[PDB]
Paper text:
Moreover, the LdG6PD wt structure, complexed with NADP(H), revealed a disulfide bond between C138 and C56; however, with minor conformational changes, an alternative disulfide bond between C138 and C61 or C56 and C97 is also possible. Therefore, we generated a second mutant by replacing C138 with a serine (LdG6PDC138S). In contrast, the LdG6PD wt and the LdG6PDC138S mutant, complexed with NADP(H), G6P, or both substrates, adopt C121 space group symmetry with one dimer in the AU (AB). Comparing the LdG6PDC138S structures to the wt structures revealed no major conformational changes (RMSD = 0.4 Å with 1056 residues). Accordingly, the mutation revealed no alternative disulfide bridge and the oligomerization profile did not significantly differ from the wt. Although the KM of G6P increased by about 20%, indicating a lower affinity, the activity Vmax increased to the same extent so that catalytic efficiency remained stable. For NADP+, catalytic efficiency slightly increased from 14.5 ± 1.6 µM−1 s−1 to 17.3 ± 0.8 µM−1 s−1 due to the increased Vmax but stable KM.
The housekeeping enzyme glucose 6-phosphate dehydrogenase (G6PD) (EC 1.1.1.49) is the first and rate-limiting enzyme of the PPP. It catalyzes the oxidation of glucose 6-phosphate (G6P) originating from glycolysis to 6-phospho-D-glucono-1,5-lactone (6PL), whereby the cofactor NADP+ is reduced to NADPH. In the present study, we describe the crystal structures of Leishmania donovani G6PD (LdG6PD), both native and complexed with one or both substrates. The LdG6PD monomer contains three domains: an N-domain (Q5-K49), the NADP+ binding “Rossmann-like” domain (residues D50-I248), and a β + α domain (residues D249-K552).
Residue numbers in the entry:
A (entry chain A): 7 to 51, 65 to 475, 480 to 552
B (entry chain B): 7 to 51, 64 to 551
Amino acid sequence: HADQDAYVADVDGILDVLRAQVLERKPDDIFQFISKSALSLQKDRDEQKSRALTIIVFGASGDLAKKKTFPALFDLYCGGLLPPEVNIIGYARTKVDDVEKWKHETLMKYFSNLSERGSHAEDFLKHISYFCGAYDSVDDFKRLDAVIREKENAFKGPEKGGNRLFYLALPPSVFASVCESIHKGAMPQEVGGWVRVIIEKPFGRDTKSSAELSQALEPFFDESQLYRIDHYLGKEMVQNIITTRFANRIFSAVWNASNIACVQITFKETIGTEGRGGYFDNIGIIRDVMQNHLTQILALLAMEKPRSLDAECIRDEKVSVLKCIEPITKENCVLGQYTASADGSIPGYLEDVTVPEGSTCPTFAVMRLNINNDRWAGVPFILKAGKAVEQKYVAIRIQFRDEVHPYGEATQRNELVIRAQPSEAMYVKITTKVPGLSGDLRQTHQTELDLTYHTRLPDAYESLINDALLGNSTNFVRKDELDVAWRIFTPLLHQIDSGEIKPIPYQAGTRGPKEADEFIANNGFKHQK
Amino acid sequence: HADQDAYVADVDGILDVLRAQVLERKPDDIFQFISKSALSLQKDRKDEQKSRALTIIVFGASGDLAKKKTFPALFDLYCGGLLPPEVNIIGYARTKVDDVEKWKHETLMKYFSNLSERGSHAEDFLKHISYFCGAYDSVDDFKRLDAVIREKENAFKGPEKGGNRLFYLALPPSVFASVCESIHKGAMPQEVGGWVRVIIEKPFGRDTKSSAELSQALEPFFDESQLYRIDHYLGKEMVQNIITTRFANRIFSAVWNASNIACVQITFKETIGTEGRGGYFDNIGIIRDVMQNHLTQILALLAMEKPRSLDAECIRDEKVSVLKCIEPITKENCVLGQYTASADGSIPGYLEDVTVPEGSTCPTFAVMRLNINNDRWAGVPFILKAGKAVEQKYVAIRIQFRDEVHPYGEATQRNELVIRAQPSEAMYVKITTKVPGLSGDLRQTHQTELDLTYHTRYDVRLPDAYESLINDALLGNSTNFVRKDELDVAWRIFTPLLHQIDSGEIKPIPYQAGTRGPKEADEFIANNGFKHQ
Ligand SMILES: NC(=O)C1=CN([C@@H]2O[C@H](COP(=O)(O)OP(=O)(O)OC[C@H]3O[C@@H](n4cnc5c(N)ncnc54)[C@H](OP(=O)(O)O)[C@@H]3O)[C@@H](O)[C@H]2O)C=CC1
Ligand SMILES: NC(=O)C1=CN([C@@H]2O[C@H](COP(=O)(O)OP(=O)(O)OC[C@H]3O[C@@H](n4cnc5c(N)ncnc54)[C@H](OP(=O)(O)O)[C@@H]3O)[C@@H](O)[C@H]2O)C=CC1
């Protein structure tokens, strides 16, 4: 045969994936971990149809729309999470003389798993049309409204009107123009239907510019209609944070300063900005992922118990705890900027032709936040994010206060870890006895206890779009929430923009600046064993 | 000549194994069984106690406990490398034995386990065993025993002189005081060096007065660093599960109290009945048999305050302190049962035993509530349950945590912590977690069990509770042994109830063997803080 080279190739394929999984979890029980992971790798081997639904994607010619938004709508479609009569309209200034060719040669190529999904892509494209128009024309939005109304009137069922989800896959400088135009020309039919508007980051760049944008949108849409989306906040992580704590006496009781020594929230990527460091260059890693994404995780982790599990009680508590956070100081922040990797594989951040010469834009930051309330006073909250570092990894790590007595050096800090990348996991680390008579009471082991552990759908982005269709605003930042968050970070961001602290170089592929790990060790973190 | 002795040795070695296998596996064709085994056997093929001589003296060596449990446990420690290389084991009993080597190779070896693979080890082990036919109340015999022990102590290949002496009383308790007086008078360790430890078998009395009288009888001869009152059922693995999982860890240390725990149940369940020995059981009852001793020690370890160190006596100090916070159990806090024949007829009733007095009201089942009146536990019901001839074999601790009513409401329930010893070891929490992805909104949850145990690389076939206890005595660790003050406090918790029972004031409810027990018992548990899952 030549299939012998294919059987060997597959075998070596399963075994290398198993190798990487075992080497990540590092269980002492290698045999049973190998056993289950092979069994699991073989595994991988009417409320809402009641009304017409129209999705309008502004900026549909752009990078985000064709590479992420339309493919996510495709995945929701194939998962049967869109109603069967959904109509999707792309809206953009770009002339398109031939709409069917645009759908097939531009949009369809970025659809995922086109092999297995035979005939589903062409079915989905039937739900898509294109409107070439201006974002700031009231008349064009009246014309768009006539087109939407024709699609809503085709709905076969008895519910009148139609729901409209507007998706602003556009620079934020166009947001207020689009929302005014919708308000004046294309609100839902009076006979029935909601309007919801998905807004993309950046939501301003400091307290004053973000407040200006919110003030510009609020004449047109209220906080039950605006959905400020954070692509990275998956439903699974949020449920792990809320349910594992608040449904359980054991975890609820220790979620406080009497029991917790340190909290770290960490967002790491091996990729750099190598492609287009240029438009990262005026944002930097703090605005990019930490004032928005890591701070929402922080709010969900640190909030008081909400009055119910309803969306706005949860957002109420996110706002309440964020208000207890002192503005971060320049003394509590260490910045990095990555250079070329030791092996030359990854060029340095400045070696990008789209990055201005002499840029001091930070690609790495670690900072300490202080939450000054009864539950959290004195507990270090460390946020860390970095581009081009040693691994792809996103996790929460809670370190509990050590029980010095009576085990002494035979014990150490308990931990609770909630990981989103490279795979979902949630586990605790505690001291246990060692089985067998070889060990007296002082012979212990630091043991990991997995609540969940996945190998490396709908994804997080798709779950948020689905959340907006279902009217669930939990994972979206509210207007008041956003202002408080910007007030935590803006004094620091101003100090950085004045050069008061400056990034330390680090080679792509390392952990980052050595000073960042020194800062972490100085702010209450302790390494296991 | 060397090979002639080596050959006969090997032959006798195979023969001893075969005889043991036939005597134990009781085949009706002896000839066929010997042949199948013989061919199969062909196919089958610390520095501190290396330092001084060790002598283990087993009194009552002729008896049932000695041959069936104590010597085989000693064999298992020998194979696990847990006895010093030149250890000397002396069986001491009144029974005349005209042929000691026959006793060692036919009577003792019959009960050694896994002779298939350990037969040559069994022969090595028996070279360490001698037999002393003697009286327990003889000054002169104990002088003679001391001379035997000293001769072999004094030949020891090692740095320190003298020798450590471990005495095991595999005897009725009525003999303890006399044999202890004899040891103290004539067979204490040489003054030049060595400790003495004495393992005492149960029962330790049968109420406060009788138990105190026995302790008062023993204390002129051995202090509490010398007496080891053994409970065979309290294994090292459960005790470390109780102590380490809590006190080494912030997470469990912080919820181990009445602000967090709604109720605690400690349960000892057997499917077997009294198995034709109902007369022996009839004068003991289930409370004295397993509850005042075994379950109460588990309770003390679960409920105690943090010990000042992990030293054995610091732990025993805390066991004593928490037991002193418990009022004597009253009959309104107790439900008793006595088992009748199983519905299928496979288990005869307790009263159908011919050795059981007619009209006996002896309890074979009991559930009771104990209150620990202190800051950590005030208001927390502690339920002890023990039963013969019930629906399953099961020994566990179950801790129910106070429910988190808000915000999940009926989408959550009480967390639980379970520590299980039988029929297999386990330790886990039951908690409420999200249900994967999909429709599942925040309020869609399920209960899952989070294992709390360390999973080692190879399957650890760790020894039984009994052998770990003998090892602990050999190493000088009294943690799992009941101390004299602890014993008295425990009897005072239970004796007023045992008096009420012996006065007829509470009379067992019948229940068929194989059921859970009297239905009044499950009602009692439901009325005292437990909630079904
Ligand atoms: N993966 C991604 O692409 C990322 C997306 N984002 C955010 O998502 C949103 C869209 O991202 P992306 O597609 O990359 O952005 P683009 O800058 O590529 O804009 C998308 C579309 O918007 C129109 N557009 C661009 N500039 C203007 C302008 N001044 N006035 C009117 N229309 C304009 C263009 O379509 P036309 O000319 O046809 O009208 C363009 O094709 C932005 O808010 C962005 O900050 C942030 C992080 C990464
Ligand atoms: N598996 C078991 O058998 C269990 C027993 N125990 C306890 O262990 C101890 C011994 O158990 P077990 O072997 O069954 O008891 P036995 O009644 O069988 O006595 C053990 C030995 O002690 C001697 N003996 C018996 N009665 C007397 C007496 N009045 N005076 C002097 N010697 C006597 C006998 O040896 P000799 O005549 O040769 O001197 C006997 O063989 C007891 O305290 C028992 O309650 C606890 C756990 C389980």
